[PDB]
RNA sequence: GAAACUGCGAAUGGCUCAUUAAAUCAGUUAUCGUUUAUUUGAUAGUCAUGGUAUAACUGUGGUAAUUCUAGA
């Protein structure tokens, strides 16, 4: 291609979207925004496919002009909106809210969220840095550009912030002995506490996690998410609390 | 210059302003298969099950909670009466627009069933509904405009009798906000009060019109 | 003999949409093939709605007969229906009139001759109209 | 004038008699009444008699009829309704007239008065079929003879007074009316072996 | 472009085109099934050569070995619930013993003739071409349909038909038309 | 609301594998050696408001002819 596309295939979705091959030979390419592309979800995927509540492009699209939702208070009007992982996902017909969250089977999962869960929301600092005039402030695992930051705080590290002033509210360092997600992976959504970090001299680092039923699997720090502390998670968790059986 | 001559889109742009010179009030000019109207175990009770279906708003599913506990009769409703009423002007002081179209519906269809009875309630009902039209000037909402004033001509239509024969002291009810400065405020408690009026027999209309020339001379500073 | 029942499942209000949507399963044993509008109609009168607000399609009977299922719809209001509603669908209700139109190819050659066509092209026409004159 | 002030009125005096009720009872429980209505309506197990009864006291009393092998029997036992609030009966003269209806395997029914407690059953009236509705074709769908002409077997009351169906084993529900005991509808069940078991 | 949708040949030809054991077996089974095609008996004889080629690897696979277990368990389950495999003979053995004549016999026609709805097994896909007898409920005219035992029991003949249901075809009406015609002449 | 100016797209889609034998492709990198229209999130104290136009349009024209144009 002499440039970008704006087509994307039926089969060239992400696997994890569960979306068939017979009533389309067209997937949304979902259109540029926080997340990166494979582990997004386009608003009329989520609302047709899971919440059912609409069943045409036109009708999700009148819904998008009568201005519904907000995501993070924020409403958008497009429909190929990539949401991503841990999204809040506000319903003011229905009064109901949403956290976009990993599945135990390896899809997303639609969580249904108090307003106070949903008036605050959490985030990995993927990079601090310092700007101009001598800054400082961080980058997010969602985008969020966030000046003047507590200062123990560094990289990778998990952090609530309040939507409703897009505020830090506060952070979790990055220790042993810590509850955490694991988003990407053939092992994602298996929530555990960290066994350890075997680190690589700028290579692919490797953690060690140990998850209730004493299981042990190792990720890499890109998949590794802090939740929070041993029994103590900042959010509410869905049904199997990411355990995996047979 | 107003849009004399249509688009094709489905889809205008409508501001607000627009929608108030638009809106008008009476059911009468309008008419539909109204649910209460429709289904005759109870009118309070129809719209209820009605409302239980459609709205989803927390303040109203608190509310419904509670008096779907309470009432499930006539005779509840007869037993039961101040504390629903209480339940309806608590959440109305609770302020949710959402919840603000269906608990105006139940008030409607609550006074049409209680009526002869109601105007104890009916009078600190028309104080806190005027209220709420206040906070509706402070909101931007033409719907909820059109559902109070639907309500009110609703409770009108219900309650013409006694307000008939009291008419005088409804007029003085509204007068604050007949008298408020806002136009529109006006334009519609006019149009509620002057279904009343037209209704209204010649002994009251004689009485009641030289108490409003008197009442005119009392504020005639105003002109709203 | 034939009695006509009309059932739904799996209910759910769509505030949103101002509406319920609802999979509609109907016995006409001793029938056959019961029409949209009557469905319409006793589904207005079962809900206290109304058939224009109302809308039903999407039906298959089964193998044999006697029973058929599809979709229906009943939005809050009339104004609900005329906001949302496909258009062919209120064509079909006769709420909205067909619109007629030149064919697509009608329509794309009258696009081409125009898109050849340059400006406005009045003065054009005088231009030939004279040179033809001449 | 209006149906809401009728409503009301007879709300009215609904609760009138509920408070005069709750004033004899003594000589909050008149919303714990209307709660009952409530869960009449629909509820749960909520009638809870089962210590009041006094059982070693129980007047008995066995009444020997003159037709044999009887099959079953239903009771129609008129209740003033909630949301409307005439009867549940149809006819004024009724006025809640506890009524029986037996159907026994000599091909009648019989229709009883039971209105009072003391006395017994009274045979108000009666209908038999016989080999005479015996039908001509004897394979068809068609059921339709107006009485019974083998062995009926059970026998349903309408709650709303006003029909009484009946079914046995000539594969036909026969439908009459409850004062004449004349067949109002006859519904063949179109089987060989589709024989009325029980009704509900 | 779009999804291929997936497909398959349900059978497959025999090794030596022509055997006379072979072929005398075919004929007793059709003319013992009133079945009627070389074809029908590739596919559930491929059915069963699948099915206990399968068998054979799991029996190859080692004992207590979950994956063994479970499709060991999946394969039985579903045997008995079609009806092939008893609940006694619940054994991989069993299964390798299961027969193309006991599929035979749990195919419908074989199952409704057992239930004597008609005088023949070729009588009884006639009536099932007919469409005259349901399954449960619902309405069949295939008289390969391998049946439950839930449904074995609920087989029964079809309320439109005239026989268990509505009225008489158009032969024996239009009979009657012309006879209520000459009879009223 | 024609037309016209302005904006953006028109660097995808669809069709074919001519060519090409470490080339592509595949896996595995990495760019602390590059730019990024767009999305998104942040981000700026350091005249009661000049001028030039030109389309569209009016009007005169060319030719055998084109989604040609010229003058004004």
Same mark, same amino acid.
């Given at each position: 291609?002499?440039?970008?596309?704006?087509?994307?295939?039926?089969?060239?979705?992400?696997?994890?979207?569960?979306?068939?091959?017979?009533?389309?030979?067209?997937?949304?390419?979902?259109?540029?925004?926080?997340?990166?592309?494979?582990?997004?979800?386009?608003?009329?995927?989520?609302?047709?496919?899971?919440?059912? !509540?609409?069943?045409?492009?036109?009708?999700?699209?009148?819904?998008?002009?009568?201005?519904?939702?907000?995501?993070?208070?924020?409403? #958008?009007?497009?429909?190929?909106?990539?949401?991503?992982?841990?999204?809040?996902?506000?319903?003011?017909?229905?009064?109901?809210?949403?956290?976009?969250?990993?599945?135990?089977?390896?899809?997303?999962?639609?969580?249904?969220?108090?307003?106070?869960?949903?008036?605050?929301?959490?985030?990995?600092?993927?990079?601090?840095?310092?700007?101009?005039?001598?800054?400082?402030?961080?980058?997010?695992?969602?985008?969020?550009?966030?000046?003047?930051?507590?200062?123990?705080?560094?990289?990778?590290?998990?952090?609530?912030?309040?939507?409703?002033?897009?505020?830090?509210?506060?952070?979790?360092?990055?220790?042993?002995?810590?509850?955490?997600?694991?988003?990407?992976? #053939?092992?994602?959504?298996?929530?555990?506490?960290?066994?350890?970090?075997?680190?690589?001299?700028?290579?692919?680092?490797?953690?060690?996690?140990?998850?209730?039923?004493?299981?042990?699997?190792?990720?890499?720090?890109?998949?590794?998410?802090?939740?929070?502390?041993?029994?103590?998670?900042?959010?509410?968790?869905?049904?199997?609390?990411?355990?995996?059986?047979? | 210059?107003?849009?004399?001559?249509?688009?094709?889109?489905?889809?205008?742009?409508?501001?607000?302003?627009?929608?108030?010179?638009?809106?008008?009030?009476?059911?009468?000019?309008?008419?539909? %298969?109204?649910?209460?109207?429709?289904?005759?175990?109870?009118?309070?009770?129809?719209?209820?099950?009605?409302?239980?279906?459609?709205?989803?708003?927390?303040?109203?599913?608190?509310?419904?909670?509670?008096?779907?506990?309470?009432?499930?009769?006539?005779?509840?409703?007869?037993?039961?009466?101040?504390?629903?009423?209480?339940?309806?002007?608590?959440?109305?002081?609770?302020?949710?627009?959402?919840?603000?179209?269906?608990?105006?519906?139940?008030?409607?269809?609550?006074?049409?069933?209680?009526?002869?009875?109601?105007?104890?309630?009916?009078?600190?009902?028309?104080?806190?509904?005027?209220?709420?039209?206040?906070?509706?000037?402070?909101?931007?909402?033409?719907?909820?405009?059109?559902?109070?004033?639907?309500?009110?001509?609703?409770?009108?239509?219900?309650?013409?009798?006694?307000?008939?024969?009291?008419?005088?002291?409804?007029?003085?009810?509204?007068?604050?906000?007949?008298?408020?400065?806002?136009?529109?405020?006006?334009?519609?408690? /006019?149009?509620?009060?002057?279904?009343?009026?037209?209704?209204?027999?010649?002994?009251?209309?004689?009485?009641?019109?030289?108490?409003?020339?008197?009442?005119?001379?009392?504020?005639?500073?105003?002109?709203? | 003999?034939?009695?006509?029942?009309?059932?739904?499942?799996?209910?759910?209000?769509?505030?949103?949409?101002?509406?319920?949507?609802?999979?509609?399963?109907?016995?006409?044993?001793?029938? /056959?093939?019961?029409?949209?509008?009557?469905?319409?109609?006793?589904?207005?009168?079962?809900? %206290? /709605?109304?058939?224009?607000?109302?809308?039903?399609?999407?039906?298959?009977?089964?193998?044999?007969?006697?029973?058929?299922?599809?979709?229906?719809?009943?939005?809050?209001?009339?104004?609900?229906?005329?906001?949302?509603?496909?258009?062919?669908?209120?064509?079909?209700?006769?709420?909205?009139?067909?619109?007629?139109?030149?064919?697509?190819?009608?329509?794309?050659?009258?696009?081409?001759?125009?898109?050849?066509?340059?400006?406005?092209?009045?003065?054009?026409?005088?231009?030939?109209?004279?040179?033809?004159?001449? | 004038?209006?149906?809401?002030?009728?409503?009301?009125?007879?709300?009215?005096?609904?609760?009138?008699?509920?408070?005069?009720?709750?004033?004899?009872?003594?000589?909050?429980?008149?919303?714990?009444?209307?709660?009952?209505?409530? /869960?009449?309506?629909?509820?749960?197990?909520?009638?809870?008699?089962?210590?009041?009864?006094?059982?070693?006291?129980?007047?008995?009393?066995?009444?020997?009829?003159?037709?044999?092998?009887?099959?079953?029997?239903?009771?129609?036992?008129?209740?003033?309704?909630?949301?409307?609030?005439?009867?549940?009966?149809?006819?004024?003269?009724?006025?809640?007239?506890?009524?029986?209806?037996?159907?026994?395997?000599?091909?009648?029914?019989?229709?009883?008065?039971?209105?009072?407690?003391?006395?017994?059953?009274?045979?108000?009236?009666?209908?038999?079929?016989?080999?005479?509705?015996?039908?001509?074709?004897?394979?068809?769908?068609?059921?339709?003879?107006?009485?019974?002409?083998?062995?009926?077997?059970?026998?349903?009351?309408?709650?709303?007074?006003?029909?009484?169906?009946?079914?046995?084993?000539?594969?036909?529900?026969?439908?009459?009316?409850?004062?004449?005991?004349?067949?109002?509808?006859?519904?063949?069940?179109?089987?060989?072996?589709?024989?009325?078991?029980?009704?509900? | 472009?779009?999804?291929?949708?997936?497909?398959?040949?349900?059978?497959?030809?025999?090794?030596?085109?022509?055997?006379?054991?072979?072929?005398?077996?075919?004929?007793?089974?059709?003319?013992?099934?009133?079945?009627?095609?070389?074809?029908?008996? !590739?596919?559930?004889?491929?059915?069963?050569?699948?099915?206990?080629?399968?068998?054979?690897?799991?029996?190859?696979?080692?004992?207590?070995?979950?994956? #063994?277990?479970?499709?060991?368990?999946?394969?039985?389950?579903?045997?008995?619930?079609?009806?092939?495999?008893?609940?006694?003979?619940?054994?991989?053995?069993?299964?390798?013993?299961?027969?193309?004549?006991?599929?035979?016999?749990?195919?419908?026609?074989?199952?409704?003739?057992?239930?004597?709805?008609?005088?023949?097994?070729?009588?009884?896909?006639?009536?099932?071409?007919?469409?005259?007898?349901?399954?449960?409920?619902?309405?069949?005219?295939?008289?390969?349909?391998?049946?439950?035992?839930?449904?074995?029991?609920?087989?029964?003949?079809?309320?439109?038909?005239?026989?268990?249901?509505?009225?008489?075809?158009?032969?024996?009406?239009?009979?009657?038309?012309?006879?209520?015609?000459?009879?009223?002449?």
């Amino acid at each position: 291609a002499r440039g970008p596309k704006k087509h994307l295939k039926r089969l060239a979705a992400p696997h994890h979207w569960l979306l068939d091959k017979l009533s389309g030979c067209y997937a949304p390419r979902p259109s540029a925004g926080p997340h990166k592309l494979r582990e997004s979800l386009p608003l009329i995927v989520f609302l047709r496919n899971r919440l059912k !509540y609409a069943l045409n492009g036109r009708e999700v699209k009148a819904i998008l002009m009568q201005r519904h939702v907000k995501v993070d208070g924020k409403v #958008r009007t497009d429909t190929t909106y990539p949401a991503g992982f841990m999204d809040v996902i506000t319903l003011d017909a229905t009064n109901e809210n949403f956290r976009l969250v990993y599945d135990v089977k390896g899809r997303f999962a639609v969580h249904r969220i108090t307003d106070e869960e949903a008036s605050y929301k959490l985030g990995k600092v993927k990079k601090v840095q310092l700007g101009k005039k001598g800054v400082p402030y961080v980058v997010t695992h969602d985008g969020r550009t966030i000046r003047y930051p507590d200062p123990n705080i560094k990289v990778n590290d998990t952090v609530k912030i309040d939507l409703a002033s897009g505020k830090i509210t506060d952070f979790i360092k990055f220790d042993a002995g810590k509850l955490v997600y694991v988003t990407g992976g #053939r092992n994602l959504g298996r929530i555990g506490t960290i066994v350890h970090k075997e680190r690589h001299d700028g290579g692919f680092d490797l953690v060690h996690i140990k998850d209730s039923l004493d299981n042990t699997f190792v990720t890499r720090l890109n998949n590794v998410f802090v939740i929070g502390e041993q029994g103590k998670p900042y959010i509410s968790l869905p049904k199997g609390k990411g355990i995996k059986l047979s | 210059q107003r849009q004399t001559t249509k688009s094709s889109k489905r889809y205008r742009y409508s501001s607000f302003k627009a929608r108030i010179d638009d809106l008008k009030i009476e059911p009468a000019r309008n008419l539909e %298969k109204r649910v209460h109207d429709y289904v005759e175990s109870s009118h309070f009770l129809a719209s209820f099950d009605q409302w239980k279906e459609i709205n989803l708003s927390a303040k109203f599913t608190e509310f419904a909670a509670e008096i779907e506990h309470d009432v499930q009769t006539l005779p509840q409703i007869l037993y039961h009466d101040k504390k629903i009423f209480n339940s309806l002007v608590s959440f109305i002081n609770f302020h949710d627009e959402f919840s603000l179209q269906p608990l105006l519906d139940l008030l409607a269809q609550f006074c049409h069933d209680l009526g002869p009875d109601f105007l104890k309630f009916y009078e600190e009902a028309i104080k806190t509904l005027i209220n709420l039209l206040d906070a509706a000037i402070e909101f931007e909402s033409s719907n909820v405009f059109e559902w109070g004033f639907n309500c009110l001509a609703y409770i009108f239509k219900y309650l013409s009798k006694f307000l008939v024969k009291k008419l005088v002291l409804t007029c003085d009810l509204l007068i604050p906000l007949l008298s408020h400065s806002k136009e529109y405020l006006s334009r519609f408690s /006019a149009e509620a009060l002057s279904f009343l009026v037209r209704k209204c027999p010649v002994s009251n209309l004689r009485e009641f019109v030289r108490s409003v020339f008197e009442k005119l001379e009392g504020d005639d500073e105003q002109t709203n | 003999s034939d009695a006509v029942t009309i059932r739904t499942r799996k209910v759910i209000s769509n505030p949103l949409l101002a509406r319920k949507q609802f999979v509609v399963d109907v016995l006409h044993p001793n029938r /056959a093939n019961v029409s949209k509008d009557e469905l319409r109609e006793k589904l207005a009168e079962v809900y %206290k /709605a109304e058939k224009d607000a109302v809308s039903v399609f999407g039906f298959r009977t089964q193998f044999g007969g006697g029973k058929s299922v599809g979709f229906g719809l009943v939005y809050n209001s009339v104004a609900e229906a005329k906001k949302f509603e496909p258009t062919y669908r209120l064509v079909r209700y006769g709420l909205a009139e067909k619109v007629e139109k030149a064919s697509r190819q009608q329509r794309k050659q009258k696009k081409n001759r125009d898109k050849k066509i340059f400006g406005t092209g009045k003065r054009l026409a005088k231009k030939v109209a004279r040179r033809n004159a001449d | 004038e209006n149906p809401a002030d009728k409503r009301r009125r007879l709300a009215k005096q609904y609760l009138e008699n509920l408070k005069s009720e709750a004033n004899d009872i003594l000589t909050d429980i008149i919303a714990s009444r209307l709660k009952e209505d409530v /869960a009449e309506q629909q509820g749960r197990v909520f009638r809870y008699f089962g210590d009041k009864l006094l059982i070693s006291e129980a007047k008995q009393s066995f009444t020997r009829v003159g037709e044999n092998n009887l099959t079953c029997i239903s009771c129609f036992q008129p209740v003033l309704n909630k949301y409307t609030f005439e009867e549940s009966s149809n006819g004024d003269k009724n006025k809640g007239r506890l009524f029986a209806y037996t159907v026994s395997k000599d091909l009648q029914l019989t229709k009883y008065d039971i209105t009072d407690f003391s006395k017994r059953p009274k045979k108000l009236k009666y209908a038999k079929g016989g080999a005479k509705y015996i039908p001509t074709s004897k394979h068809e769908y068609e059921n339709t003879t107006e009485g019974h002409y083998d062995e009926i077997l059970t026998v349903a009351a309408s709650p709303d007074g006003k029909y009484v169906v009946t079914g046995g084993r000539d594969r036909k529900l026969i439908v009459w009316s409850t004062e004449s005991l004349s067949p109002v509808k006859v519904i063949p069940t179109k089987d060989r072996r589709g024989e009325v078991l029980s009704l509900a | 472009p779009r999804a291929p949708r997936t497909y398959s040949k349900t059978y497959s030809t025999p090794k030596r085109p022509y055997e006379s054991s072979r072929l005398d077996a075919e004929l007793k089974l059709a003319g013992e099934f009133g079945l009627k095609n070389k074809k029908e008996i !590739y596919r559930i004889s491929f059915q069963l050569s699948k099915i206990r080629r399968a068998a054979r690897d799991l029996l190859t696979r080692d004992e207590k070995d979950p994956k #063994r277990l479970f499709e060991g368990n999946a394969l039985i389950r579903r045997l008995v619930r079609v009806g092939v495999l008893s609940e006694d003979k619940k054994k991989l053995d069993y299964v390798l013993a299961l027969k193309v004549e006991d599929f035979l016999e749990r195919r419908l026609q074989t199952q409704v003739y057992k239930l004597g709805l008609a005088k023949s097994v070729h009588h009884a896909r006639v009536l099932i071409t007919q469409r005259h007898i349901a399954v449960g409920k619902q309405i069949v005219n295939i008289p390969s349909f391998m049946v439950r035992l839930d449904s074995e029991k609920h087989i029964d003949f079809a309320p439109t038909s005239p026989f268990g249901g509505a009225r008489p075809g158009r032969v024996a009406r239009r009979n009657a038309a012309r006879k209520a015609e000459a009879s009223g002449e």
